[PDB]
RNA sequence: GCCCGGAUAGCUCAGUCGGUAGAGCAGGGGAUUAGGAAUCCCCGUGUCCUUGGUUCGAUUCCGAGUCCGGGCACCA
RNA sequence: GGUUGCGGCCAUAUCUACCAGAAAGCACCGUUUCCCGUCCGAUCAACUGUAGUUAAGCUGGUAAGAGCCUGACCGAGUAGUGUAGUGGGUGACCAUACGCGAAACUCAGGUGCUGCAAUCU
RNA sequence: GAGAACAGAAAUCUCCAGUAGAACAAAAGGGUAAAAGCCCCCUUGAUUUUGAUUUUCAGUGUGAAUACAAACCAUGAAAGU
RNA sequence: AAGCUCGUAUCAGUUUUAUGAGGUAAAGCGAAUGAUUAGAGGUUCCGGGGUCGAAAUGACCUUGACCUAUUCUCAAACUUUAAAUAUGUAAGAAGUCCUUGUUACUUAAUUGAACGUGGACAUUUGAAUGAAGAGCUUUUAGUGGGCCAUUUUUGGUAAGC
C-alpha cells in the first residue's frame, strides 16, 4: 500500500557526502552551543541517534536547551495557515552554527567604529546598507582598444 | 500481431528498460549493429556519411533491422561487402507495453523495444572511400522509407568514424601522433609518463619519414 | 647492502588435513603436540559440502605454528627427508615456500600405531627483521622494496645454506 | 608488483585521517574521551596521555581544541636524572616516578600543592585523593592510553599509581595492577611497593648476580659502572621521590645551538623541489636523451 | 462509483486570505522541557538575587 | 486471445538440489531345440522441441521462439 | 628549519616506481626471571639500552606518472530553465522577447598547511 | 593472485593485493573498517517513577522513536556506553 | 456579525544583501553499478575443441573466460558532478558593550552557566517597496459530488477517458 514512515523519501538526503564517509571529525564535538544560538540542521546517516525528521533538514532554528550530548531546538513550522512552535531534541552531530549572524555582527561592529569616528570628527555616518546603484557616466577610450567589428557567421555542419 | 508504429512513435512515457524490475521481456529483432569492412583501418575509409534524425521520436527494432538489411543489400550488390564500414549508432533500449475485460489493472506487458532519438541524433553512419558517395547516399536514401519521421543525410567533414577533420587528421598522421589500433586510432598526448608515451608513439620526437 | 636485511625465517607452519572429525584428528593433534613441544592449534570447516562428507564448523584438520631455532631444527629434519631436493612451484613470489609428505614417522617420531599413520603439509615463511612494522599496532606499516623477501632471493638463500638442490625450473 | 591500482580505484578511495594513516591514534577512543557534557560548555576534559617508546616514556596532560591539542604540563623519563635516576628509565619504577613528577608539577604550577599532598607514605595501597571539605575539589584527569593494550602487569599502571599517589584524582580500578590475585580479586600492596621501588628488578639483579654474571654485566653494565647493587634501589627511588616532592618543576635544557642555529645547520640537508622551468628543462633533456627508436 | 481522491487546489489561497500570519514571539519565553536540573538551580539563584536586590533597599 | 501444462532412441514414456542420457517395445546377431514358436541375451539408437544465457559444468537453473494440450466472460 | 609526542583540517596529505637521509629522536634491534598472554615471548607482556642497524619502517626529492585540489572571456552563454504571445509548425516539436545559468571537455597551475610542549648541529 | 601430500572447481595452512565489491535475522534503501562486521570475557539498561518532545496530526489518541531528570545496575583501567 | 486592546505600530503571497539546505532537468559511463557494439593486443600457467612422435603434466591452431588500452549507445527505481524555478533563517532598543551582584547547578577556582543592578552608545534605529492600519477573541451559517485551460506529469494505442 502506502508508506509514510519516519525515514521515508530519504534515499539521497541521508546518503552520505561522497568520499566523506568515515568517523566524523571532532570539531563537531568540540563546538559549543549556548542558549540563544542559531543553528542549521544537516542530518548524518552515520549517526542514527538523535536524528531529526526529514522535514527539518535544511532549516535553521534557535537552541532552547542543552544536555549531555544533545541540544533542544526551537523551530517554527508552517501548517496550513499558521506557524507552530516545534521543540526538537537533537544530538549535536546534526548541527552547525549560522554564518548569517556573523555577517550581521560584523556589520554592527563596523557601524559602531564608523559612528565613533564620525562622533569624533563631527561628520556624517550613513551606515545603513544601500542597494546596488546602476552606474555613473563613464568614458572609455579607443587608445589601443580599437573596435573589432563583428558579424554573424553562416550555418555550417559541425557534426 | 505487431500493432502499428504510430502507437509508439513519440516519446510519451519515461524510459522503461530491461532490468531487475522489468525482466521477462523479449529479445531485440536487431542484434547486428556493425557491418561491412568492420575490420578496416582508419586510413582505408576517410569519408563518412551520417544519417541524422530531425524529429524527436522512437524507432522500432524491426524498422532498424529492415533499414540495415536494405542498405547492406544495396552496398553488397553494387559495391561489395568490402567497400564500407556501416555502424548503427542507436540501440533499442526502451520497452513498449500493451494492455491487450476492463481498464482495471491496465499496466501493460512488454511488446517490443525502441530507440529514443533526438534532433541532430545520428542513426546510421557509414565510413567509405570517396568513390562510393552516390551509392551510400542512395543506400541511406532507400533506408529513409523504412523509418517514420524525417531523417536527413549529412556528409560529414570528418575522417571517417573517430573525429578530427581531414586536415587536422593529416597533421597528426604526418606528425606521427597516431597509432592504429584495430579499426580505430590511439593518439599521443602530452600528459602521461614520457617513457610509455614513446613506447606507444616512438616516432613523434624521432626523425620519422 | 647487508647490515640488517641479512636474512631469516619468520616461522614455519605444518598442516594435517584429515577430512573429518574425531579420533584421527585428535591423533594428529597428539602428533603435533609431541612433534612441536607446543600444544597444537586446530582448524574448523568453513561451509558444509557433501562431496567431502564434512559440515560447517567441524574440526576437520589441525595445524601448528613453529618458530625460532626449534622450527629451524625441525625444518632441517624435514629437509633431510626431502633429500635436499626441492622444485620450483613450491615457492611464493613472496619467497615463502613449502611442500608435502607422507608417513610423519620418517623423522624423530617412531611409529605409534595408536596414533596411526598420516602425512602432512610443510610450509615455511621467510622474512627479514623489521617485519614487525606490519604487525605492531602503533605505526603499523608496510615494507620497502630494498627488503621484501621474494622467490629468487629465498631460492638463493636456500641453496647458499643447506647445500640444497632446486629442480626443473 | 602488478597490483596497479587504477584511476577509478584511486578516484573513489577515501583516505583515512592522517593519524590513522600513520597508525598512532584511535579516534574512537578520542571521541569518548573528549566529548564533554555540553551543559558545562567549556570545562576542558584533561587527559593524561601516556606513551611508551623503546627508550623514552612520555607523560603529558592534554586538552583538546579545534585548532589542536594543548598541553598543560609534560614529563619525560629522561628527566628523572635531575631527581637521581639515571639507569632503567623505561621500567616500572621510572614510570611511577614520572607519574609522581607530572602530578606534583601540575599542582605546584597551579597553586594547589599545599593541599592534596597525596600519600607520601608509600606502601602500595590503592586509594584516591579525597576532596577537602571547606576547600577546592581535587583535579580530575582521565588516563589516555592510546593504542596500547590493557593488560594486567603493565608499566602504564605504574605511572597511574604515581599520578594517584602524587595528588591527582585519577579514576581507576585495581584489577590491572600486578600482584592482583584475580580469582581472589585482591591486590598485594607489598608487591606493588616492590614494583614501585624496583623490587622485581632488584630481585632479578640478585638472581642474575648468582645465576649468570656475564648477562648481569651486559645488561647492568651501567649499574656496574656507577657502583650500583640491587638493594640500593629502594633508597634511590625514595630519595628521587623526595626530591620530586621538593621541586617537581620543569627546569628545561640549555639549548646550545639555539632555534635559528638549528634551522641554519641542523636542517639544511633537504632537497627543495624544482621549479616549473626546471621540470620543463628536465623533460626537454629527457626527450633529448630518449630520442632514439629503442 | 469513483470520486476524486485528493488534491491541494485552492487551499493555498484559502490560507493566504487570513492566513499564515507569524509565530508571534515574545520576550521572556517558556521553560518547557528544559533541563529540570538548572531549572531547579536557577530558581534558587533568582530567590537569592531577588533577596539581595531587595535587602539593598533597606 | 489471453490464464495454465507439456515437448527424450524409430515409437513410447523415466531425469538425485546439475555431474549421467534411463526403460521398454520396433530392430541386427545368437542362444534354444529333432526342427520351429517362445524365451533368455546381447548391437545399437536419442542437442531429452528450438535457440539464448546459467555455472566449474545446465540435459534436469532461467528467459525468448515453436507445436500441442486443460480452461474462459455472470445480469439485463 | 628537523625530530618526537599529542592533535586540527583530513589526498595540495594518497598510490606505483626509484633516489637520498649529517645531529639527535623514533623505529628496527638485544633477551624471556618476574606480571601477563599466546598453539607458538611472532603478537601481547616484562628486563636491559646493553649486543648490532638505517637494510626496512619514518622524512624529503624525483616521474610531461595515476589520482587529488584550485582556477580560466576552453568548452558554453551552449545544454537546461522561470515568465509572454490570437508566435511558427498537421503534429512532433521549434524559434523569438525579457532573465538565470550548468556538468562533461580542454588548457593552465599545485602536490600537504598548521597549533601546544620536549628535544636536535 | 601465488603456493603446499593425500586433496581435485572447491576441504585445511601459509604470504601479497584487496574503500568494503563482505557481513550486520528478514523486504529495499541508508549507514558501518583498530567497526555497527568476525572471535572472546562479563553482564540483564529489554529494569524503576512520572513528565517533555518528534513523526502520523485535527497539532486528538494509539503505535514507534528521541532527549533529559531522580533511582538502581552492568561493563570498562577509565573517559564513558 | 459583534466587536475588544492599541495605533504608527508592527507588519507583508515582494525584492535585495549574507548564509544554508536539496539530487530533479541536464551531463556522464575511456567514474562506480547495471546494460551494450566493435575491433586491439595480450593472456606459455592448458578451461575447452583440434594438429604435431597414441607420446606429453611439451610445442603449433582455433576458442573461450580473464588481463591492458580503445571504441558505439542507455537508465523512473545507476551516478562523480550538478542548474533554473522554488525554500528556511538574520537585516537590532526585546540592541551593542562595560560593570560586577546572586545560585543547592558547573568549575581545581570569582571558573562557568543563567538572571539582575548601575554606566556609555537614537539626528541615521541602523537594505529596498508598500502599509485605505496592527493584533486578539468569541460565535455561527453554507461547503465537505467539482470542472476546464497553460506548463510539468502517471496509466492507456487513444480519447470531449
Curated annotation (Swiss-Prot), chain B:
<comment type="similarity">
    <text>Belongs to the universal ribosomal protein uL16 family.</text>
</comment>
<feature type="repeat" description="1">
    <location>
        <begin position="155"/>
        <end position="169"/>
    </location>
</feature>
<dbReference type="InterPro" id="IPR047873">
    <property type="entry name" value="Ribosomal_uL16"/>
</dbReference>
<dbReference type="GO" id="GO:0006412">
    <property type="term" value="P:translation"/>
</dbReference>
<keyword id="KW-1017">Isopeptide bond</keyword>
<comment type="function">
    <text>Component of the ribosome, a large ribonucleoprotein complex responsible for the synthesis of proteins in the cell. The small ribosomal subunit (SSU) binds messenger RNAs (mRNAs) and translates the encoded message by selecting cognate aminoacyl-transfer RNA (tRNA) molecules. The large subunit (LSU) contains the ribosomal catalytic site termed the peptidyl transferase center (PTC), which catalyzes the formation of peptide bonds, thereby polymerizing the amino acids delivered by tRNAs into a polypeptide chain.</text>
</comment>
<feature type="region of interest" description="2 X 15-17 AA approximate repeats">
    <location>
        <begin position="155"/>
        <end position="204"/>
    </location>
</feature>
<dbReference type="GO" id="GO:0005737">
    <property type="term" value="C:cytoplasm"/>
</dbReference>
<dbReference type="InterPro" id="IPR016180">
    <property type="entry name" value="Ribosomal_uL16_dom"/>
</dbReference>
<dbReference type="InterPro" id="IPR001197">
    <property type="entry name" value="Ribosomal_uL16_euk_arch"/>
</dbReference>
<dbReference type="Pfam" id="PF00252">
    <property type="entry name" value="Ribosomal_L16"/>
</dbReference>
<feature type="cross-link" description="Glycyl lysine isopeptide (Lys-Gly) (interchain with G-Cter in ubiquitin)">
    <location>
        <position position="100"/>
    </location>
</feature>
UniProtKB/Swiss-Prot annotation, chain C:
<dbReference type="GO" id="GO:0006412">
    <property type="term" value="P:translation"/>
</dbReference>
<dbReference type="InterPro" id="IPR031310">
    <property type="entry name" value="Ribosomal_uL5_N"/>
</dbReference>
<dbReference type="Pfam" id="PF00281">
    <property type="entry name" value="Ribosomal_L5"/>
</dbReference>
<dbReference type="InterPro" id="IPR031309">
    <property type="entry name" value="Ribosomal_uL5_C"/>
</dbReference>
<keyword id="KW-0694">RNA-binding</keyword>
<keyword id="KW-0488">Methylation</keyword>
<dbReference type="GO" id="GO:0019843">
    <property type="term" value="F:rRNA binding"/>
</dbReference>
<dbReference type="InterPro" id="IPR020929">
    <property type="entry name" value="Ribosomal_uL5_CS"/>
</dbReference>
<comment type="function">
    <text>Component of the ribosome, a large ribonucleoprotein complex responsible for the synthesis of proteins in the cell. The small ribosomal subunit (SSU) binds messenger RNAs (mRNAs) and translates the encoded message by selecting cognate aminoacyl-transfer RNA (tRNA) molecules. The large subunit (LSU) contains the ribosomal catalytic site termed the peptidyl transferase center (PTC), which catalyzes the formation of peptide bonds, thereby polymerizing the amino acids delivered by tRNAs into a polypeptide chain.</text>
</comment>
<comment type="similarity">
    <text>Belongs to the universal ribosomal protein uL5 family.</text>
</comment>
<dbReference type="InterPro" id="IPR002132">
    <property type="entry name" value="Ribosomal_uL5"/>
</dbReference>
<dbReference type="GO" id="GO:0002181">
    <property type="term" value="P:cytoplasmic translation"/>
</dbReference>
UniProtKB/Swiss-Prot annotation, chain D:
<dbReference type="GO" id="GO:0005829">
    <property type="term" value="C:cytosol"/>
</dbReference>
<keyword id="KW-0699">rRNA-binding</keyword>
<dbReference type="GO" id="GO:0022625">
    <property type="term" value="C:cytosolic large ribosomal subunit"/>
</dbReference>
<dbReference type="GO" id="GO:0003735">
    <property type="term" value="F:structural constituent of ribosome"/>
</dbReference>
<dbReference type="InterPro" id="IPR005485">
    <property type="entry name" value="Rbsml_uL18_euk"/>
</dbReference>
<dbReference type="GO" id="GO:0005737">
    <property type="term" value="C:cytoplasm"/>
</dbReference>
<dbReference type="Pfam" id="PF17144">
    <property type="entry name" value="Ribosomal_L5e"/>
</dbReference>
<dbReference type="GO" id="GO:0000027">
    <property type="term" value="P:ribosomal large subunit assembly"/>
</dbReference>
<keyword id="KW-0694">RNA-binding</keyword>
<feature type="modified residue" description="Phosphoserine">
    <location>
        <position position="164"/>
    </location>
</feature>
<feature type="modified residue" description="Phosphoserine">
    <location>
        <position position="173"/>
    </location>
</feature>
<keyword id="KW-0539">Nucleus</keyword>
Swiss-Prot record, chain E:
<dbReference type="InterPro" id="IPR002673">
    <property type="entry name" value="Ribosomal_eL29"/>
</dbReference>
<dbReference type="GO" id="GO:0005829">
    <property type="term" value="C:cytosol"/>
</dbReference>
<dbReference type="GO" id="GO:0003735">
    <property type="term" value="F:structural constituent of ribosome"/>
</dbReference>
<keyword id="KW-1017">Isopeptide bond</keyword>
<feature type="cross-link" description="Glycyl lysine isopeptide (Lys-Gly) (interchain with G-Cter in ubiquitin)">
    <location>
        <position position="51"/>
    </location>
</feature>
<feature type="compositionally biased region" description="Basic residues">
    <location>
        <begin position="1"/>
        <end position="25"/>
    </location>
</feature>
<dbReference type="Pfam" id="PF01779">
    <property type="entry name" value="Ribosomal_L29e"/>
</dbReference>
<keyword id="KW-0963">Cytoplasm</keyword>
<keyword id="KW-0832">Ubl conjugation</keyword>
<dbReference type="GO" id="GO:0005737">
    <property type="term" value="C:cytoplasm"/>
</dbReference>
<dbReference type="GO" id="GO:0022625">
    <property type="term" value="C:cytosolic large ribosomal subunit"/>
</dbReference>
<comment type="similarity">
    <text>Belongs to the eukaryotic ribosomal protein eL29 family.</text>
</comment>
Amino acid at each position: 500500500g502506502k508508506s509514510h514512515g519516519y525515514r521515508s523519501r530519504t534515499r539521497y538526503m541521508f546518503q552520505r557526502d561522497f568520499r566523506k564517509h568515515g568517523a566524523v571529525h571532532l570539531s563537531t564535538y568540540l563546538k559549543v552551543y549556548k542558549v540563544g544560538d542559531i543553528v542549521d540542521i544537516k542530518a548524518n546517516g552515520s549517526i542514527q541517534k538523535g536524528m531529526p525528521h526529514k522535514f527539518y533538514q535544511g532549516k535553521t532554528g534557535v537552541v532552547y536547551n542543552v544536555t549531555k550530548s544533545s541540544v533542544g531546538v526551537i523551530i517554527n513550522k508552517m501548517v496550513g495557515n499558521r506557524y507552530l512552535e516545534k521543540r526538537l531534541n537533537l544530538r549535536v552531530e546534526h548541527i552547525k552554527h549560522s554564518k548569517c549572524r556573523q555577517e550581521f555582527l560584523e556589520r554592527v561592529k563596523a557601524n559602531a567604529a564608523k559612528r565613533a569616528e564620525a562622533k569624533a570628527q563631527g561628520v556624517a555616518v550613513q551606515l545603513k546598507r544601500q542597494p546596488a546603484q546602476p552606474r555613473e557616466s563613464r568614458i572609455v577610450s579607443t587608445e589601443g582598444n580599437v573596435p573589432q567589428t563583428l558579424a554573424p557567421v553562416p550555418y555550417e555542419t559541425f557534426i | 500481431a505487431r500493432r502499428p508504429a504510430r502507437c509508439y512513435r513519440y516519446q510519451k512515457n519515461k524510459p522503461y528498460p530491461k532490468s531487475r524490475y522489468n525482466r521477462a521481456v523479449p529479445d531485440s529483432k536487431i542484434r547486428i549493429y556493425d557491418l561491412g569492412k568492420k575490420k578496416a583501418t582508419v586510413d582505408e575509409f576517410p569519408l563518412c556519411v551520417h544519417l541524422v534524425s530531425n524529429e524527436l521520436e522512437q524507432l522500432s527494432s524491426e524498422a532498424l533491422e529492415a533499414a540495415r538489411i536494405c542498405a547492406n543489400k544495396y552496398m553488397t550488390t553494387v559495391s561489395g561487402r568490402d567497400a564500407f564500414h556501416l555502424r548503427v549508432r542507436v540501440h533499442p533500449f526502451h520497452v513498449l507495453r500493451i494492455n491487450k475485460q476492463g481498464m482495471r489493472g491496465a499496466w501493460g506487458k512488454p511488446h517490443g523495444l525502441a530507440a529514443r532519438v533526438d534532433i541532430g541524433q545520428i542513426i546510421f553512419s557509414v565510413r567509405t572511400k570517396d568513390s562510393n558517395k552516390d551509392v551510400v547516399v542512395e543506400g541511406l536514401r532507400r533506408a529513409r522509407y523504412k523509418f517514420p519521421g524525417q531523417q536527413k543525410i549529412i556528409l560529414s567533414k570528418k575522417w571517417g568514424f573517430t573525429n578530427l577533420d581531414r586536415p587536422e587528421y593529416l597533421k597528426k598522421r604526418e606528425a606521427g601522433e597516431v597509432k592504429d589500433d584495430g579499426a580505430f586510432v590511439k593518439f599521443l598526448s602530452k600528459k602521461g609518463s614520457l617513457e610509455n608515451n614513446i613506447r606507444e608513439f616512438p616516432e613523434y620526437f624521432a626523425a620519422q619519414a | 647492502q647487508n647490515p640488517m636485511r641479512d636474512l631469516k625465517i619468520e616461522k614455519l607452519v605444518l598442516n594435517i588435513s584429515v577430512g573429518e572429525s574425531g579420533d584421527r584428528l585428535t591423533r594428529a593433534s597428539k602428533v603435533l603436540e609431541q612433534l612441536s613441544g607446543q600444544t597444537p592449534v586446530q582448524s574448523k570447516a568453513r561451509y558444509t559440502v557433501r562431496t567431502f562428507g564434512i559440515r560447517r564448523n567441524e574440526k576437520i584438520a589441525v595445524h601448528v605454528t613453529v618458530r625460532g631455532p626449534k622450527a629451524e631444527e625441525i625444518l632441517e629434519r624435514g629437509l633431510k627427508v626431502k633429500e635436499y631436493q626441492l622444485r620450483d612451484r613450491n615457492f611464493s613470489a613472496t619467497g615463502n615456500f613449502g611442500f608435502g609428505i607422507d608417513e610423519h614417522i620418517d623423522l624423530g617420531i617412531k611409529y605409534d600405531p595408536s596414533i596411526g599413520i598420516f602425512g602432512m603439509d610443510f610450509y615455511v615463511v621467510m622474512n627479514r627483521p623489521g617485519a614487525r612494522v606490519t604487525r605492531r599496532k602503533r605505526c603499523k606499516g608496510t615494507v620497502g622494496n630494498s627488503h621484501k623477501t621474494t622467490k629468487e632471493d629465498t631460492v638463493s638463500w636456500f641453496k647458499q645454506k643447506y647445500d640444497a638442490d632446486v629442480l626443473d625450473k | 608488483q602488478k597490483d596497479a591500482k587504477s584511476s577509478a580505484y584511486s578516484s573513489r578511495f577515501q583516505t583515512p585521517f592522517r593519524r590513522r594513516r600513520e597508525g598512532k591514534t584511535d579516534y574512537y577512543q578520542r571521541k569518548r574521551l573528549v566529548t564533554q557534557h555540553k551543559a558545562k560548555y567549556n570545562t576542558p576534559k584533561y587527559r593524561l596521555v601516556v606513551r611508551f617508546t623503546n627508550k623514552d616514556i612520555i607523560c603529558q596532560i592534554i586538552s583538546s581544541t579545534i585548532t589542536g591539542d594543548v598541553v598543560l604540563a609534560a614529563a619525560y623519563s629522561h628527566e628523572l636524572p635531575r631527581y637521581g635516576i639515571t639507569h632503567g628509565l623505561t621500567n616500572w619504577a621510572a614510570a611511577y616516578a614520572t607519574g609522581l613528577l607530572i602530578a606534583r608539577r601540575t599542582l605546584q604550577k597551579l597553586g594547589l600543592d599545599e593541599t592534596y599532598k597525596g600519600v607520601e607514605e608509600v606502601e602500595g595501597e590503592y586509594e584516591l585523593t579525597e576532596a577537602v571539605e571547606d576547600g577546592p575539589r581535587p583535579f580530575k584527569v582521565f588516563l589516555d592510553i592510546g593504542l596500547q593494550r590493557t593488560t594486567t602487569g603493565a608499566r602504564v599502571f605504574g605511572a597511574l599509581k604515581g599520578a594517584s599517589d602524587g595528588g591527582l584524582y585519577v579514576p581507576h580500578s585495581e584489577n590491572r595492577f600486578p600482584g592482583w590475585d584475580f580469582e581472589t580479586e585482591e591486590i598485594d600492596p607489598e608487591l606493588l611497593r616492590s614494583y614501585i621501588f624496583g623490587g622485581h628488578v632488584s630481585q632479578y639483579m640478585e638472581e642474575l648476580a648468582d645465576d649468570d654474571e656475564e648477562r648481569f654485566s651486559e645488561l647492568f653494565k651501567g649499574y656496574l659502572a656507577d657502583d650500583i647493587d640491587a638493594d640500593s634501589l629502594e633508597d634511590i627511588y625514595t630519595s628521587a621521590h623526595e626530591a620530586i616532592r621538593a621541586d617537581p618543576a620543569f627546569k628545561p635544557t640549555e639549548k646550545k645551538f639555539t632555534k635559528e642555529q638549528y634551522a641554519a645547520e641542523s636542517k639544511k640537508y633537504r632537497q627543495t623541489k624544482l621549479s616549473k622551468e626546471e621540470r620543463a628543462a628536465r623533460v626537454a633533456a629527457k626527450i633529448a636523451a630518449l630520442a632514439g627508436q629503442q | 462509483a469513483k470520486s476524486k481522491n485528493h488534491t491541494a487546489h485552492n487551499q493555498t489561497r484559502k490560507a493566504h486570505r487570513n492566513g499564515i500570519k507569524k509565530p508571534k514571539t515574545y520576550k521572556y519565553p517558556s521553560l518547557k522541557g528544559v533541563d529540570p536540573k538548572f531549572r531547579r538551580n536557577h530558581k534558587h539563584a533568582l530567590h537569592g538575587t531577588a533577596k539581595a536586590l531587595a535587602a539593598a533597599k533597606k
